């Protein structure tokens, strides 16, 4: 039986601030995790917990734990977005299991995420492209292999055709200092159109890049032309999309050929949702590389959920503290993270940290 | 709607099914997204029986299996508590219901939701000048289509722009699609409204360079620039603001953000277009009320259906705001559509019953027995 459910905001910051992408202004160091502490049996788990009330919270205290689940086992719907995390941990805590056994040395690939336009005060593109590489070596010097870069400079924050050249200076350059081993992703968010894509794809022949990730709203038509062009040139690039407000039809759209890589979040829909998802996407020949931005915690459930989905790709990570949350389980190490073989999720949250801040700022 | 009249006796006794096939005027070329829409058109269209009279209209998500479980329920069934017509019948039923009521009324479903005269636009100018290398020629082409529909009676035009996004290259496609606005202007004189379309081929960028270099023209709305985002519109207006550029922003069609009335509520969007066939007329006479409430616009979007165009002109009367019918010049076998006219960047709505469009019974008969299909006696 459910008996006791706690809530507190943990606040923390990113390893190094982070500036505008292609749509919206500067993301800042800045960062925060909402997490819940449940109790099942004198036992508590911790985890990421939204979308959850005082009022919502008073109306499951006494639940029977078995209540909460689904025949299949399948956390229902109606809890997943509030208790999945919280949950899952109390689970792999009592079965002194990790998630990823409960699900199934692991072993994930990871790429820096934190690349965006750090270089808008800069009129000298060399002055640009020495910032970028830099902040790209910090990142290898912490061990990562793999880099997705902000691009789409011209699409609101700078001229159109200016900004463009500097995104293909930026990717380059960055090319140069990742290595040759090195996989680079490219990120639009939103702010190109097709011709533009192509052009910036085109002057990137030479570059080792991956996948391209929201080069534009996600169309049917565009990709499905998009990804003939790419044939017909030979260049080996994936369509990525699918984080925020998604196109109800991209998942259809992707079993159609024209998206390889699935981005919905792993907060929201969530973990439970991805492991039916990805064993949906699995069965297509489809990828799954779950979003993860603004929320530490998620880094760390998608290294768990790598165990339960064939086609996972990678972890998207950003180098982040956040007080009373204690990471050291995990390791980065060339281009991959190691996910500790510990308890539930393997995070070790300080009790007195989130107790105080349980009373002073949250609920119970 | 007044839902008094209806008999408790009144059941659907029949449900028949077909699809009318027909032509625009002029073939429609590629827009910003997708290749050349062509000549064809078709409407697919339900006749429903009940108490020994017929309502005909546009019918969609309708199969035998699904109309088989509609005939026998009583008229009365098909409505709310508030009398609003249900969800569940809404895609499917409301155009021949709502026909019906006006035909048993002997009035014009204009009068049942409230001489009819609406402001419309000519929404016929696709990238018909893709196969023009020369800019001059190009202009030159657009404008006589413009013409064409000036002589129809057409004062206000919609244009595809967004030229550059993926038919041409993304410079010229755009000098092109600026060159071609500016000339259907001329055209359109003082009194045309100018409406430009981009099908979401544009960035933000591209399209504060082509608003900045179209300063001279009426531009009286921008139409999906590019998929709706409340951080771009938030700039976008704020930066019209600064030039005093008075042009409204309007989008809605497709598959739209859930977010898009909130965001319009807020300030980002002035102009709703979804679609007259989905979510369709009951869904459009709430939304209406509610956009109304906000100080919102409304302009459905009507386009690959005929049908749609008659229909909007009667959600008018529902609207306060409504802006304008979307028209496109077709001819649909056995739909006669004559009691409307086009005047002067008007459509005027016939007075008679139901919907005002006459359809051959003989030949629709004919198409539901050859290839469409009956439930019901
Ligand atoms: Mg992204
Ligand atoms: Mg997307
Ligand atoms: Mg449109
Ligand atoms: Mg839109």
Known sequence: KVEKIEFAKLTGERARSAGANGRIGVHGKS??????????????????????????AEDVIGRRLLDL??????????????????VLDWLGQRQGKPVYDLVSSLVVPCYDTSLYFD????????????????????????????????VGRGGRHMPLWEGTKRDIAIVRGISEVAGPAGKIMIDANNAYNLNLTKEVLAALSDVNLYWLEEAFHEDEALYEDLKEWLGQRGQNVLIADGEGLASPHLIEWATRGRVDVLQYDIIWPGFTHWMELGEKLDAHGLRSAPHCY?????????????????????????????????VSGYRIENGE????????????????????????????
């Open 31 to 56: 960062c925060t995790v909402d997490i819940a502490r449940i109790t099942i049996d004198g036992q508590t788990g911790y985890g990421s917990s939204i979308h959850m009330t005082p009022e919502w």
């Open 69 to 86: 689940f689904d025949d299949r086992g399948r956390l229902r719907e109606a809890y997943r977005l509030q208790l999945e995390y919280p």
């Open 119 to 150: 270089d808008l005060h800069l009129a000298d593109e060399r002055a640009a492209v020495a910032l970028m590489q830099e902040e790209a070596m910090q990142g290898y010097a912490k061990g990562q292999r793999h880099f997705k870069i902000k």
């Open 294 to 326: 603004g929320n530490a915690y998620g880094i760390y459930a998608s290294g768990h959920l790598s165990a339960a989905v064939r086609n996972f790709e990678f972890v998207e990570y950003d180098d982040i503290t956040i007080e009373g949350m204690d």
């Open 337 to 364: 993270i190691h996910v500790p073989a510990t308890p539930g999720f393997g995070i070790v949250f300080d009790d007195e940290l989130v107790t105080y801040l349980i009373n002073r700022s949250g609920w119970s």
